[PDB]
Design a protein around this nucleic acid. Structure first.
Lengths: 140, 255, 143, 207
RNA sequence: UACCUGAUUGAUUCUGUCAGCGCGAUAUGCUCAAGUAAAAGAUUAAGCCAUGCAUGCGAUUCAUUGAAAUUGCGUACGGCUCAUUAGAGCAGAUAUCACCUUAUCCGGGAUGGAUAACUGCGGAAAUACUGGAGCUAAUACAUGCACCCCAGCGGGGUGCAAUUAUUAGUGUUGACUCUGAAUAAAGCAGUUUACUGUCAGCUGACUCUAUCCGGAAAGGGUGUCUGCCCUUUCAACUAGAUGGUAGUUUAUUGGACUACCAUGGUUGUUACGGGUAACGGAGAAUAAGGGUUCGACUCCGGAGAGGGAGCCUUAGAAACGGCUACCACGUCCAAGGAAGGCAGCAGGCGCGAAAC
RNA sequence: GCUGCGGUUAAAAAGCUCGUAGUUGGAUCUAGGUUUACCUUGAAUAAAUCAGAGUGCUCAAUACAAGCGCUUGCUUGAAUAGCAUCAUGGAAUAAUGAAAUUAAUGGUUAAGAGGGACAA
RNA sequence: GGAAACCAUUUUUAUCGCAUUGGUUUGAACCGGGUAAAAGUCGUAACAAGGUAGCUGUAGGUGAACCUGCAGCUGGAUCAUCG
């Protein structure tokens, strides 16, 4: 059982702090290497340069080739793989393009049947991918 | 900072001045003088808000440059002069005399008095000492120093000071049973009869005061100001007689 | 015995050399006691004594003002200085419980208090900075 | 420059302290005066608030005091004899507070003879010089002689002081800080203090 | 409003997380009738900055009302930013019997010589650069107008502040080596209106300027008690370090510093070290209660002005829209030299997801 | 998870014991007919913000105003609530101290606590 | 008597040199671990007494799962066997 004495405040506080580190959320939010490990460095979006277009085989039981793109981030030069959402939108993305990349939705974890991809494309050539898909705007 | 400060932000201004929040970034900073910054009121504010004789702070200066306002029998032309507690402000042109007194809430009011009242004021004996040449003096809480006072006058006592003759007239003694005004603390603006005195040697003594309504309240001796012998006040008091109305009683009285 | 240093120590406000006393032959050297105050009695060792210490609250020039604290003598190994340990309890609101805390307060121990030992309860009065760390003077030994 | 800040020191526990700010003017120091025996030389120092201090670099005349007789005479500093702090100050003739020095005895002897109308351990075979006679063998009315006769009642001077007067140099102690007030005012040693310092000087000379 | 719902199984009950769901911050997509308040280059680059502005206004008036210049006062406040910083800094209480102060309050205390504007002569490619020659003012500069001793006939000294020493004990404070009263020398350089305008009737009354002493107020420097992040893959740390005496320095206390001496001081009640994408607080978001997280940012306190260091002037600065140097980086040169500091407002470049 | 989690099998009882710091510690002194700790009440305690009183900014978010006569005016609001220090009272609970010429001269009991002795 | 340049020295001390040390980041031949990925190769270790019950600690060996020795456990395939 936990201590219950009237003069055990130090033990209770110190034990709580010691055991908070065994918590994934607390450790993930206070470890100290978060900025150097996260590709975005704690940001929500990041600009990058497209290096190549790749296809990722969907996980089972699904079958498809998800059209992803390899990007190098400008702010730190780290390489990531980002998903190009919507149908036939890989055509809009040319090699050596400036793309805005955002998280995929699950805070650094893969989403759906796409394995190992944690980012998606929001803008290409300073144009919204959704706008291009909907026909609102055209390629600069 | 690197030296003395000359400004006073509106939000940093004393709350009891009751300035409006959105009335600019700054407030008139009282000059040093007879009264403490937190327990005073700029002569500019007196005309701007309490009296409404001046619409703006250029008009306050215009009024005061005419040499028409007397404080303690002397003409003051500085709009930043720190008028404070028990100060006689005389506007000769309009033949108006006020004494700066505290409301029960703890705010300065417009207490209009007559010439007989304006001829004098009360001061608290802050010190009794002997200056060079072996001459006795007493120093009050408003900075005044008076030479050759009655040897029976001690600290914390009240002295009636004649503005016309610059002389002490009477001395009321700080002892139990005398009327007393509260100038600081949360009991500011309250008037009662001095009761028990807790004598803390190395600290500030504590004074218990019971008002005419039977309400008791304590405070620190440095906030107590004797204003009369027994129960008779040497000066008049604003409407309320220093009776702290309860919050329910205030609504009932309003209705 | 009182003079054991490289300089002659004497109470500044006492004229050891007065013609009247010298001619009378009086060997009785007057001693200055300042009567600390706040209801504190000058120890008889301070009143009738030959030691000179400019930092004694009674035989010295150290006014006592500020805070009056109490504690337990922890160590007496310095020259006329002791370390006072003050024990208290700190309350942590979240846990509604206390924890033991302590702080050491070095204080100047006048030679008037000759029977000072680790364990004795003492009272200390605040004074002006006497050294880098000393700002308190022993006033009473409750033992 | 020279600073008096408390930081830059360790803490009671021995920890290094954080530097709070750049050196501030109000915590400055200045070089020591290091007053020496020599022709009068006092410089003026402008201090905080517009006040002033008097840094004495060289001093020769000191305005000393005889306590038992309750008088004060201006004599001349001859030499430095003893210093509790350090011997280098004695050897370099530095005038610092609490320093034991040798001063001229003649002003005090003159005052004594003009005040009690008695010799001060005058020589046992030498006739008084004319200036001495002008104050010793002077002749005035019995009305005035009454005053001197009364004061002669209490005139015994300690033997240890008489020995110093014989040599003509008096052991004095500087009671002011020449670097702050610009003067070397002090007082003549006598009694247990005189015995203490005499014994110190003789022991160090013997060594 | 003290709340849950989907997902492991053929089906079941659990543990358990993931996902959903409500609010807020920042960015961003698509889209936006008129109005009203209103945040807004903090995050990274306390990175770099073209160009404009952001600090100027009684005495002295032989220029033409008042220019120019000499004085005096202010520019130490205000504005910005959050880099440093973990007994630092801050919050509450509290000392300064250990101290410093312009402006503001209360008491007390009709002398002489020279220099600018101005005239004139010049140098430099170039500065808010300056040397000579001839005048001339002051609120500049200088000068300043009852007790002790000797002798009780008579001679001297004694203003304020101030150095040292001594005497008796006129007020206080909880307490004073405080404040008063005396005595003695001495040097000490501060001070007790040669100001402006004057008015009334030899007699009066003011404004102004200058000026010290004592006490306030306002501001500041330090001192004390309590609280304030993570970390043991930091457990022992500390040598001016802890204390004593004498001095020095300071506005003042103090190992602040020096000489001699002692061996001390902190620590599992977490010292010491390390990290911080750390300025502290008032506060902000969320919110049964208990809390969790944050707080660069309008108010209060602190710090800095590219990085360090040093100082002049002053009441106040270790000032940077002050100077002096070095470091880094720029600007103009006729190559001899001369300069610069937007983390002020507005703008520019970089940086970036991110700001007129 | 202090309020307020869980550790047989789902993650989790150290192989076991001794032991310093820490934490926690039996009952017992005026029932009847000296210190602390703690609690109560006051004092000292900037605004802005939050809560909250009043007040038709046309409502609201806001703001701190305003409302009446008749002209030379009267009366107003701008409240109140929101660790450490000092003092006051209370004496349960929990620590802590007293004694190894007269008087009752001065040692609580002996835990279905613990240790030690003695038996066989 | 006042005083500028200049000289000497004390102090604060930027800055520059080596040197030592702490903290971050990072190249690298080669040597390895982990994870992920619709339909590769080799076997059959485990789940039934999984065809030699399984597992723990330890030691040795073998392409690989694994095998074997020693001492334990039942989470066993026995809650039991007659005195």
């Amino acid at each position: 059982g936990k201590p219950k004495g009237l003069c055990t405040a130090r033990k209770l506080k110190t034990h709580r702090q010691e055991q908070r580190w065994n918590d994934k959320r607390y450790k993930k939010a206070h470890i100290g290497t978060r900025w150097k490990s996260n590709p975005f460095g704690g940001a929500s979006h990041a600009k990058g340069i497209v290096l190549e277009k790749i296809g990722v085989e969907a996980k089972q039981p699904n079958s498809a080739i998800r059209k992803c793109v390899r990007v190098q981030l400008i702010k730190n030069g780290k390489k990531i793989t980002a998903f190009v959402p919507n149908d036939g939108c890989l055509n809009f993305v040319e090699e050596n393009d400036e793309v805005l990349v955002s998280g995929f939705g699950r805070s650094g974890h893969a989403v759906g049947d796409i394995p190992g991809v944690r980012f998606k494309i929001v803008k290409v050539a300073n144009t919204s991918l959704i706008a291009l898909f909907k026909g609102k705007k055209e390629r600069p | 900072m690197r030296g003395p400060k000359k400004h006073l932000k509106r939000l940093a201004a004393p709350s009891h001045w009751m300035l409006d929040k959105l009335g600019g970034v700054f407030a008139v900073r009282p000059n040093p003088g007879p009264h403490k910054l937190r327990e005073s009121l700029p002569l500019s504010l007196f005309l701007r808000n309490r009296l409404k004789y001046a619409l703006n702070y250029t008009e306050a200066k215009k009024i005061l440059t005419q040499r028409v306002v007397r404080v303690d029998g002397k003409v003051r032309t500085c709009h930043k002069f720190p008028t404070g507690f028990m100060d006689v402000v005389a506007i000769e042109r309009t033949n108006e005399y006020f004494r700066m007194l505290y409301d029960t809430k703890g705010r300065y009011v417009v207490h209009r008095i007559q010439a007989a009242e304006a001829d004098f004021k009360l001061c608290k004996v802050k010190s009794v000492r002997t200056v060079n040449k072996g001459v006795p003096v007493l120093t009050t809480t408003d900075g005044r120093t008076i030479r050759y006072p009655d040897p029976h006058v001690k600290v914390n006592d009240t002295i009636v000071f004649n503005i016309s003759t610059q002389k002490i007239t009477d001395s009321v003694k700080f002892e139990p049973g005398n009327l007393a005004y509260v100038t600081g603390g949360r009991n500011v603006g309250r008037v009662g009869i001095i009761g028990h005195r807790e004598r803390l040697p190395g600290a500030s003594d504590i004074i218990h005061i019971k008002d005419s309504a039977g309400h008791s309240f304590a405070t620190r001796i440095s906030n107590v100001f004797v204003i009369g012998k027994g129960n008779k006040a040497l000066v008049s008091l604003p409407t309320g007689a220093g009776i702290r109305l309860s919050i329910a009683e205030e609504r009932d009285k309003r209705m | 015995s009182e003079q054991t240093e490289r300089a002659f120590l004497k109470q500044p406000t006492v004229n050891l050399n007065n013609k009247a006393r010298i001619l009378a032959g009086s060997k009785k050297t007057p001693r200055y006691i300042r009567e600390v105050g706040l209801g504190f009695k000058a120890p008889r060792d301070a009143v009738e004594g030959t030691y000179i210490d400019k930092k004694c609250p009674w035989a010295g020039n150290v006014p006592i003002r500020g805070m009056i604290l109490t504690g337990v003598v922890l160590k007496n190994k310095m020259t006329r200085t002791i370390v006072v340990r003050r024990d208290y309890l700190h309350y942590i609101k979240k846990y509604r419980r206390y924890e033991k805390r302590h702080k050491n307060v070095p204080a100047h121990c006048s030679p008037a208090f000759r029977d000072i030992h680790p364990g004795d309860l003492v009272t200390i009065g605040e004074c002006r900075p006497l050294s880098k760390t000393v700002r308190f003077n022993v006033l009473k030994v409750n033992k | 420059g020279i600073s008096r800040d408390s930081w830059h020191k360790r803490y009671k526990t021995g920890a290094t302290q954080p530097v709070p700010h750049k050196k501030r003017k109000f915590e400055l120091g200045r070089p020591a005066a290091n007053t020496k025996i020599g022709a009068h030389r006092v410089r003026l120092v402008r201090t905080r608030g517009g006040n002033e201090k008097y840094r004495a670099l060289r001093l020769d005349s000191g305005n000393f005091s005889w306590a038992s007789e309750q008088t004060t005479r201006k004599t001349r500093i001859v030499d430095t004899m003893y210093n509790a702090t350090n011997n280098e100050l004695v050897r370099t003739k530095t005038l610092v507070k609490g320093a034991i020095i040798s001063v001229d005895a003649a002003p005090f002897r003159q005052w004594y003879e003009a005040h009690y109308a008695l010799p001060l351990a005058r020589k046992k075979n030498a006739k008084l010089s004319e200036e001495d006679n002008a104050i010793l063998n002077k002749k005035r009315s019995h009305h005035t002689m009454k005053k001197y006769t009364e004061r002669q009642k209490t005139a015994a001077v300690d033997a240890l002081l008489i020995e110093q007067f014989n040599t003509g140099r008096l052991l004095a102690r500087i009671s002011s800080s020449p670097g702050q007030v610009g003067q070397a005012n002090g007082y003549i040693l006598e009694g247990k203090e005189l015995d203490f310092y005499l014994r110190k000087i003789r022991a160090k000379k013997a060594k």
